Amino acid sequence: MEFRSLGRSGLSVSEIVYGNLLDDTPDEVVLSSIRAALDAGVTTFDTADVYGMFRSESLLGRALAGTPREELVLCTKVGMPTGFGPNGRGLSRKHVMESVDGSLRRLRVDHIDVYTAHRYDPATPLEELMWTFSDLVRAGKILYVGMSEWPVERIAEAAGIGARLGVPVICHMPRYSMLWRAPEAEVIPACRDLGIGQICYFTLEQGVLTGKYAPMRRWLDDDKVLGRVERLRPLAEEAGLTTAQLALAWVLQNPGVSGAVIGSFNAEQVLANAESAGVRLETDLLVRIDEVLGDSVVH
Amino acid sequence: MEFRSLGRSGLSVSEIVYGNLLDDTPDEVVLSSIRAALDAGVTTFDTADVYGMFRSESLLGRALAGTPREELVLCTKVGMPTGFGPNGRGLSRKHVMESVDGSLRRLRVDHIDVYTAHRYDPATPLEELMWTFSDLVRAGKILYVGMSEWPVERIAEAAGIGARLGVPVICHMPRYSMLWRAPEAEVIPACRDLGIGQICYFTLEQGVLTGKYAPMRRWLDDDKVLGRVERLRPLAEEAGLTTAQLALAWVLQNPGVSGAVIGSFNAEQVLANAESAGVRLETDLLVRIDEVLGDSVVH
Amino acid sequence: MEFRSLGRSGLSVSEIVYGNLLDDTPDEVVLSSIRAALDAGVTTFDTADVYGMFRSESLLGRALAGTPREELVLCTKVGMPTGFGPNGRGLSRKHVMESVDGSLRRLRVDHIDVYTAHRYDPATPLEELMWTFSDLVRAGKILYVGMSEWPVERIAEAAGIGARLGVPVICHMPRYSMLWRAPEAEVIPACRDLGIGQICYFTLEQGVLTGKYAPMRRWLDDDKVLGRVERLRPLAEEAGLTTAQLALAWVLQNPGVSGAVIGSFNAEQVLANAESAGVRLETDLLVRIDEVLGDSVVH
Amino acid sequence: MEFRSLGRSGLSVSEIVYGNLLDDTPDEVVLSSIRAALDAGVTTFDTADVYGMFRSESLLGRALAGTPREELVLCTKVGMPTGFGPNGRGLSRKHVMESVDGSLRRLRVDHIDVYTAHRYDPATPLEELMWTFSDLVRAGKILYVGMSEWPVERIAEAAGIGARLGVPVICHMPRYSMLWRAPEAEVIPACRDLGIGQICYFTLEQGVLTGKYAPMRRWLDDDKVLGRVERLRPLAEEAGLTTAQLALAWVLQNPGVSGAVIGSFNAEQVLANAESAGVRLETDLLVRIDEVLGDSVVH
């Protein structure tokens, strides 16, 4: 496995991150997939309180039990509805304080490495949120703070308050892929200046960028993109890669990216996808990828 | 139930708040009244250490036992005499530190949502008080701070120190009703600028604004006000409301108000009064209320 | 009993403070003397780690066991040698951190009300000391900080750092009596500006100001002072006081004084001396005291 | 034993410090050597998490068990690899937070006196490191911070952040001896201005400065230096010292030095070497040492 700094911090994450979003997958298949990720040298695990409604955190806690704590980077989330009523969601001191001990118990740990504000909450002043994170860092319950689906101006505001209060703000989680490049415009450049690295989701666009679908619904209902993806296969085999490994390597060519999240409940896919870590793609190949995909790419 | 932001904060309170001030009401009637409040969708409960001398907090703790913590906003107080001698009252570091664990034990909770300085204490420097609140917020024993019966200049001073020390100052508890409008002059406008919402008491003026008394002693000894209140009954029925529901809706028309406190040991009154939540009153009706009440209104 | 503010703080102390410095006094006589102080309405108790080498703190803890915590102001000290070697004394983070839990255990309490730096330590930077006090205030182990036998410039420096770090600096303990008035020149005026009240020791000058000695060694070896003290007896009886009660009232006439410490292992003396609390002395009597004592007074 | 201030702090260290770096030395010989150090009046013990991989800390904890805590200054380290993967080393919040409880358990103590950043970590922002130390000082797990093998500009940066955050930065651990004087140029002068004292290692240059080797490999492969060391023997006996005692006294003549570390698993050497504490060397002898050693001295 290869490792990157998560923003300007002493924290190293694996370049491939395992995410266990949940649903009718048996527990036993979730557990053996996490085990496959460990066997592939994945250190860094992404989850959320809301995922399978607490089931995702509980299964990760069980699967990683026994792994020395220093070998794991545990990332989880707060912000999505996990209780009833208007205080059972969002980023208030109340919801965050009433969320963190549940996540620690289910993950079976003393501290969360990265704790991500899951969606910006316009009702919570960022002074309220960041002082709550300060209290949790002082208490040793979280080490580092992240954000997902935040306006760039709010990321900047949070990073500034964090620096003043000694709360490390080091992580942003965008949607990012060969097809979805919205974050290249403003998010990644801003994050890089602020000392924040990306941990990227939908990197395989839910299987569309594995080349598996011949002529999610957004691209599946388009035979043009599916045909253009099939034409990356020669480019991939040229580099001794699967289309999946090429799509994952492509994300990791961005120097603003710390890690690429993979989902999969197939042991063989996890091991194969993990081998994307460390792969340099030639300038020539990156120009030929943009040509093949053309106007199917979202900016 | 309808919900408002408590000042500029991520905290939502129910627009109707249940207060259990105590006395010879049997425990069983207190408990069934709190239960009626829960059944009406009341999330937000007001009490104090001093109320029935600890009995109010103990009965609320018992009645709310089993309710998921995230569904409740628990408000309690410190400042009134609860022990013997000059350190058994007021807002000193000593009295606050020696008060908070008693309130947590009696309420059966890890944290108080809103902890209200009950009456301004001229002997305690506000730097002493606010650093004590900072220590309790750091420790996770209180989330948010409120005040009751404070001069406006002291509210402003506390809000400023709070912002610097990361202590949310979000709540003020005035006397406010169709008849008592003293807080409209300075308190509510100042509080709104400072990001503080009102949780209002004596909203029914101890039953005078239910229309129940035909021709507390302040208005009961005046047949003029009692006659003028009886004349709100047609205005109320016009709107499909009881006089009680009209009085409660009237308070909630103020955008500086987060919640209106109801007291009642009658299940039917609690359920009926709770239905005031969310009711818009027409401009026409608000002009006709001021006409009927005329000079009985205190400004 | 009468009570004063301890400096600019919400803390009230009894005007008469019981000190239990120790030695061959049986435990049973120490315990019954503390009990006599409680019976006289004394709330405020002074001791030190070093006193009878931990025995003073242990006996006070035993005697006050069962008294509601809010009714007591416990004052103890750190700085004098209590262990072997150069880290077994002074005001270093190390010695203070290794001292406080011993004092809490022996006093049988969760927090010390007033914790006094016993003698200024030139080897400890005041930033080191005050940040250690900050950590103990945050932790809820001490409420308020005091000082004894400090240069005035160091009191000022400590008060400034305290205000910045949210550490209340409210108490100074000088030697002060009708005969010893050194603190009137600089200490009391400076302390009053800084919001610090005096808790005064040797107020009876070890029995010299009881009028008991007819014609400590400093004044005992002078028949002039002993004769002048005997001549305060008519002035005292004029005011319906013992010479002891007059000496204690005299200290309490200073508005910079919060409390006067009494030592005594005699129940009758404790009860009699406690009645000094609240006594106003006429301007006429204060001029006649200075005349009788004349040049025996130390300035 | 003689004692010095560790930088500008209230902490006193013994002028001779015992270091137990580990290997096939039986436990019983390590334990009896630490015991010999205690018998010689050594209070101050240096170790590291990494030393004999946790064995050094465990053996020190066992040997010092029963010694009153106030009589000991325990120094340990973090930064060297103690776990697998890139988060099992360095100075990140993660590695420091996951290291400190292990060191406390193995040393059998509530707090480490001096906790030394073992080698500067270019991947960890010093704001991240110093806020982690702040959290540990607030929590009472460490008292004072030190550094080893740091660039002088980073020492200065850390000392500045420490002063702002109330983290005492008082200790630097250089290689320093009669032969190795690199730290005289910049490190010691800078440290003295910043209020940091030296605790020095390789003071006997691994036995080369005992005079024991007649005509480590750096000097052992040079018969010139070994011959020049043998010629310090008359100078040493002139002063009633062994060559070992002269080498240790020489380091302690520097006023920027708080302590000199000795390693030895020989009880007789420990007791003899400890007697170097407090020895003044004449100006004449210090000029004759520089003459004998000449150009073998590294600046």
Ligand SMILES: NC(=O)c1ccc[n+]([C@@H]2O[C@H](COP(=O)([O-])OP(=O)(O)OC[C@H]3O[C@@H](n4cnc5c(N)ncnc54)[C@H](OP(=O)(O)O)[C@@H]3O)[C@@H](O)[C@H]2O)c1
């Ligand atoms: N922060 C946020 O807002 C946020 C939101 C959503 C998700 N996330 C995180 O990001 C992750 C995204 O996971 P995702 O699965 O939705 O998106 P994805 O990683 O883009 O899609 C992975 C899917 O593609 C298919 N696939 C992968 N490798 C393959 C191979 N070698 N051969 C054939 N098929 C392959 C698999 O489905 P088949 O069963 O079809 O093979 C697999 O489940 C989540 O686990 C979660 O942790 C974060």
Ligand SMILES: NC(=O)c1ccc[n+]([C@@H]2O[C@H](COP(=O)([O-])OP(=O)(O)OC[C@H]3O[C@@H](n4cnc5c(N)ncnc54)[C@H](OP(=O)(O)O)[C@@H]3O)[C@@H](O)[C@H]2O)c1
């Ligand atoms: N912060 C402060 O300084 C402060 C001070 C005081 C109180 N408070 C809080 O505010 C609350 C005020 O309670 P309160 O009862 O004194 O004042 P209130 O709410 O103005 O009066 C309520 C009373 O009016 C009567 N009533 C209500 N609805 C009725 C209906 N539909 N039909 C007939 N009668 C009805 C009931 O008494 P009957 O038995 O006559 O029906 C009831 O007890 C307290 O519980 C406390 O939590 C705060």
Ligand SMILES: NC(=O)c1ccc[n+]([C@@H]2O[C@H](COP(=O)([O-])OP(=O)(O)OC[C@H]3O[C@@H](n4cnc5c(N)ncnc54)[C@H](OP(=O)(O)O)[C@@H]3O)[C@@H](O)[C@H]2O)c1
């Ligand atoms: N911060 C500091 O540096 C410091 C230093 C020293 C002490 N202190 C504190 O201050 C206190 C001073 O106590 P102290 O006893 O040394 O000084 P003191 O209070 O000036 O002397 C009291 C003594 O005078 C005698 N006495 C008192 N009332 C009497 C009466 N009505 N009739 C006859 N005799 C009477 C008693 O001794 P007989 O047995 O002769 O009657 C009694 O022990 C200590 O307990 C300690 O807590 C503080």
Ligand SMILES: NC(=O)c1ccc[n+]([C@@H]2O[C@H](COP(=O)([O-])OP(=O)(O)OC[C@H]3O[C@@H](n4cnc5c(N)ncnc54)[C@H](OP(=O)(O)O)[C@@H]3O)[C@@H](O)[C@H]2O)c1
């Ligand atoms: N901060 C850092 O980076 C760092 C790095 C390394 C070490 N350190 C610390 O500093 C210490 C250095 O220890 P060290 O032993 O490597 O270096 P040292 O103290 O320069 O060497 C001591 C050695 O010299 C010999 N010796 C000492 N006194 C003697 C005498 N009177 N007669 C004969 N031989 C004598 C002994 O070995 P024989 O068996 O040959 O007699 C002894 O083991 C360590 O224990 C560690 O705690 C710190």
